């Protein structure tokens, strides 16, 4: 009859009974984890970015497997061993299994940045209402010279933490992210531009210092905070964001003449066909390297900003460049192909 | 450590005048014989590594390594030996459905092994 | 039915501290709960009455690059710690208070001249650092009454933290009523500045908004 | 180039970046974004076969196992690599039940169903039927099947 | 707009074509909307023709 | 729920007997005849047994001693 | 219709032949939601020929991939068209294009984790207008199979059966076209006769009291699939020659 | 299929010495992690003569690593697999924790199970194919 | 408050019968953002209306089938007619009707005019006819709902009802379909510079702009009422 009272009964049962999930091709011990089951109104499974890479799927047409611990020993073991909330560090490399690799990294990066001097650049405060000074008005995560009294806590005493108040200047976003940060770590870690490897270092150090419980608290908080802040950014893409360096059109032309020169040698018979081929290959490689350098410089931190000096070469804001810098997605090698030449990329089977 | 086992011996050493005895078993025999009873019983052994394609046949449970690659000759040999699987390996306790001496069941199997002591 | 909307009945609120607390509500309409929470934040933050500290005339150089003169507190430091003091004007308008003490060093809230309508939530609130010797100084600070907040860069002179709160946010959770599961629940988590009951402040904000909008409903819900 | 030009002819941003408003909190959005219309196609592999469950099924006449790929509420078969993974867990109860409860057990299936009704949470190992079947297959070919104690 | 696309995948597949699609679609939807708006005032045949 | 299990691992050390003790307490609670020494909050017997063991009240020796006392009292 | 294609879809449907080309036609004579009749002008009308063409497109034809192909008519009335003109609106086509898919508005931004790697965020809007709703037509069948224990015939006479099941059946046992179907609803109800009984005093009394079934006919009925529900679009039947049931 | 932890201590001084991999141009893999979670033999001693850095059986949790980095020692003899005298698998004194369990691997730990998926994990490999001397530093 | 200067409804301009741009009085700082956002949200949220809910037509038995004399499909009939919107009186769950023959285009005007409903535009589509001899006969049942009610959301309502000939379709049941905010600051000289918010509202024309705004405001006030407690 599909009774709603039955629905209530099932929800009462569904509370204290964990479940197991796994992906299609088992490759690691990371393929299957255990977690608290929560009903969702749909026709699919909902997965946090917690076990994502370990699941080795890719948000595409895929399947998962659910396992019901029937015996009490089964439940105890799964919450004890199969539970994802324990596979923190990768059993093989020793590094964290849970390595935040989604756009949350991009959001934390957008937290700790400073263009040159934004609105209220010289603002100095305590920090608690910095959430107002940013969210309401007054401050941006991209702001510089924001001085704040920082109440760090170092567990210098044997099994005991001691607080300390300073006047560290930073950006709005880094100091804000310091709020959800746990007590142990010094704020020097929070003084950065928040790249991906930086996130990795933060996670590992936190694992070293505190322990799994606050570590998981911080991890989830980082997930939520990134999912929020990066959303405040949007960070779209467009045709103009990729900028074509005009120098290649000259440099390549120069290399073109070089090839003709090599060709002329082949016409004179002085350069062997293999020798001419090697020379042309080296010339093309050098031209490619020069063009790649030119494209990088065009996409480097090369943008003049109006200010007292009015010539302030700061970090560029193009999606691809910043994402590669922090480490979000894509490759600088990928970018060069997309905007400069794709490279040699010549191999019928082995040849060039 | 898997790739090296079943050591070959040059001197019989009162153990056996053959080749291919488990290096661990050979050492165990040497310890239980040289130290306890016959120190003069020394079997000069030679350790050589083994390849995966063949070393798979080196198993102590007949159920194990049975379907390893083929079974026809394997089953023939197992019957010819009048051999007993003895329910020892992980695959053994699994296919048999015995509490493997692993995980929490290790102690249980150990307890079973404890029961295997008294009887 | 057509115009009936779900009202929240479970209003259980857990107080973490005298200022830190989180309340939660029963099912609000899907999307309506989120709108309610966002508007609650916008109103309760964009405008919040309270007496606050704005400007002082301390004994020494009017420039920020001044000397400690044995106070062992930078001018910015003493100013910020003074901003970290809860001055509530009962009925008094912008008034002035001054302080002077011996050279103990412990700069608590008991040194300044006591007023009737002026009240301090914290008798141990820090104002400046420990003096180096028996030297004193004249505060000559003033406290005003206002709503919301204002930067001191524009309006002269330390700050305008007229809102007597610390932090607040709303979290939206989902649930089912009986079977339909598109049910929204708003749970606020807020630390207060102090001297203000979060329940009383919330009720005051609700009344403020209701009065601010009552002219629009065209005297709706007459009977 | 002609696209960006016609955008001006369409009185639209040639760059395409445009203001945005967050429907959840109503903040003017940073990073003016370029938005548009894109085509999208719905591909065959719709949900109409995705969802799949099972609670209690029938055993086969031979090997007494579950059905298969949604054939009569069928159920898929686990993986040997997954079995190795399960061993890597060292979850003896889990693997034991998987080889017992989620396997060909008939008389153990009934006992377990009765226990689950009674809330006993116990599985009885006994010996797999496939074991005796393979023993017979040995006896079926030219070798006696005899198991010592 | 009813579709908010995950944008972070833009680089790892050189899907510039998606961006070209975004631009072309914005322009074309604009052209159609303008024509329909001209229709809303029941604009003349010669004017809509030009 | 109790997301991560580290306290029970430290209380046991071998990490394989801790689950055994938890399951032994859980089966005994499910069958009956025992009372939870920790204040339950309308949850599964597994979580309650895990909490009681981690509280420093249930061990492989406490349960054995209690069982021996119960058997001898018959 | 596909807004920005590659220019080919016209021909890609023209030569494909899921639509109708106007073979030697000059103007529209009759237009119908089941066919189109076109009068051929005398210039191209063959002598002694009708000078009229009837293209009877078939809607709701269950094609190979279990999809739902239903050719639609292009013209409304009296449309003058020359030869080979696009006359039929085919599946995923619109006035002659490979109309494969929906042109939906989108914007570029990540947000709130719901668009983590390869996710698309369709709000309630495209649910409302329900663009991109899927169509399908799926079939089933049954057989009569005159048997040794007795022929199974579609008589809707199901012994020991609930009445509500028969509420949708015909005297033939068929279901009338246009019904709704959910669950394991009986589809084609045959009754396979079983081995005859003796005097059988218990069974004799059973036939005396209730009778007419005597468990002689065992349920040889067809029922709707489990977890497949719908509405009966169309039916057909083929009986071995010499069998003239033809009830419905 | 048979590898698992069964013994605690090997009681054998036999072991292998681990040194930084200074191969090719420079050191590809420093012996800071190569023995990071290792438990050496009695071969741990300070660079000074008659100066000892560590005892026979001890695992470098985190602090001996930097101290030995100050000691400028390259190779240390530690007990290893098989080398652990247990006659079946190996003793725990030559396995370490090397996993998310900061506590050492426990008795019954199927290290071979722990391994043997580990080796093949990178299913992303590549396939289908005296005169010049330069000094790096002083 | 301290002279909170609450805004009020004023300067309401009706661009069309279903297109409108209305204004309000100026308000104090910080409310205009909240006012406009909450207004757009609440207004789009719950605008009750009347629409076609179930169809019982003499001709067809299965809507996935064709019909002689008629051009559009029965599903096409359901789609185009789903464009039927009409003002409804206090009476709800009514049955309007429409039956006619001929050879001209079929318009919404050819519907049975009852005393409790009003068709906004004679220009909607009723599957314009094709043959002289054919005669369409239908009676459309209209219900009053607040939002989109799914086709199978109404499935459980009929256990022994809904014969082959009476069928259900989907709807929106919300004549709002547009509510947007634009806050400016003007007409403030005697006091501090205040902000006036203009609301762009393009309803289905079923609900009046001011009436709908008032209803939404009453809903919001009812919501905020518990918030004090």
Curated annotation (Swiss-Prot), chain B:
Highest taxon above the source species: Bacteria
PTM notes: Acetylated on several lysine residues in the presence of glucose.
Biotechnology and industry use: Co-administration of salinamide and rifampicin or salinamide and myxopyronin suppresses the emergence of resistance to both antibiotics.
Function: DNA-dependent RNA polymerase (RNAP) catalyzes the transcription of DNA into RNA using the four ribonucleoside triphosphates as substrates. Resistance to the antibiotics salinamide A, salinamide B, rifampicin, streptolydigin, CBR703, myxopyronin, and lipiarmycin can result from mutations in this protein.
Stated family: Belongs to the RNA polymerase beta' chain family.
Quaternary structure (record): The RNAP catalytic core consists of 2 alpha, 1 beta, 1 beta' and 1 omega subunit. When a sigma factor is associated with the core the holoenzyme is formed, which can initiate transcription. The rRNA transcription and antitermination complex (rrnTAC) consists of RNAP, NusA, NusB, NusE (rpsJ), NusG, SubB, ribosomal protein S4, DNA and precursor rRNA; S4 is more flexible than other subunits.
Identification of the protein by name: DNA-directed RNA polymerase subunit beta'
Gene for this chain: rpoC
Curated annotation (Swiss-Prot), chain D:
Record PTM text: Acetylated on several lysine residues in the presence of glucose.
Modification N6-acetyllysine, positions: 8
Applications reported: Co-administration of salinamide and rifampicin or salinamide and myxopyronin suppresses the emergence of resistance to both antibiotics.
Subunit structure: The RNAP catalytic core consists of 2 alpha, 1 beta, 1 beta' and 1 omega subunit. When a sigma factor is associated with the core the holoenzyme is formed, which can initiate transcription. The rRNA transcription and antitermination complex (rrnTAC) consists of RNAP, NusA, NusB, NusE (rpsJ), NusG, SubB, ribosomal protein S4, DNA and precursor rRNA; S4 is more flexible than other subunits. In pull-down experiments interacts with CedA.
Family the entry assigns: Belongs to the RNA polymerase beta chain family.
Entry function: DNA-dependent RNA polymerase (RNAP) catalyzes the transcription of DNA into RNA using the four ribonucleoside triphosphates as substrates.
Protein name: DNA-directed RNA polymerase subunit beta
Species in which this protein is naturally found: Escherichia coli (strain K12)
Full protein segment contained here: 1193 to 1341 of 1342
UniProtKB/Swiss-Prot annotation, chain F:
EC number: 2.7.7.6
GO cellular component: cytosol; cytosolic DNA-directed RNA polymerase complex; RNA polymerase complex; transcription elongation factor complex
Keyword field: DNA-directed RNA polymerase, Nucleotidyltransferase, Transcription, Transferase
One function term, GO molecular function aspect: DNA binding
An example Gene Ontology biological process: bacterial-type flagellum-dependent cell motility
Keyword match Nucleotide-binding: no
Highest taxon above the source species: Bacteria
Keyword set includes Transcription: yes
Reaction catalyzed: RNA(n) + a ribonucleoside 5'-triphosphate = RNA(n+1) + diphosphate
Subunit and interaction comment: The RNAP catalytic core consists of 2 alpha, 1 beta, 1 beta' and 1 omega subunit. When a sigma factor is associated with the core the holoenzyme is formed, which can initiate transcription. The rRNA transcription and antitermination complex (rrnTAC) consists of RNAP, NusA, NusB, NusE (rpsJ), NusG, SubB, ribosomal protein S4, DNA and precursor rRNA; S4 is more flexible than other subunits.
Function in brief: Promotes RNA polymerase (RNAP) assembly. Latches the N- and C-terminal regions of the beta' subunit thereby facilitating its interaction with the beta and alpha subunits.
Protein family: Belongs to the RNA polymerase subunit omega family.
This protein's name: DNA-directed RNA polymerase subunit omega
Organism: Escherichia coli (strain K12)
Shown chain mapped onto the complete sequence: 2 to 75 of 91
Swiss-Prot record, chain I:
Keyword Amino-acid biosynthesis: no
Post-translational modification: (Microbial infection) ADP-ribosylated on both alpha subunits by the phage T4 protein ModA. ADP-ribosylated on only one of the alpha subunits by the phage T4 protein Alt.
Keywords, alphabetical: Acetylation, ADP-ribosylation, DNA-directed RNA polymerase, Nucleotidyltransferase, Transcription, Transferase
GO biological process: bacterial-type flagellum assembly; bacterial-type flagellum-dependent cell motility; cell motility; cellular response to cell envelope stress; DNA-templated transcription initiation; intracellular iron ion homeostasis; nitrate assimilation; regulation of DNA-templated transcription elongation
Entry annotated with the keyword RNA-binding: no
Stretch list, region Required for interaction with Crp at class II promoters: 158-161
Identification of the protein by name: DNA-directed RNA polymerase subunit alpha
Originating organism: Escherichia coli (strain K12)
Organism lineage string: Bacteria, Pseudomonadati, Pseudomonadota, Gammaproteobacteria, Enterobacterales
Gene this chain is encoded by: rpoA
Parent-protein start and end of this portion: 5 to 233 of 329
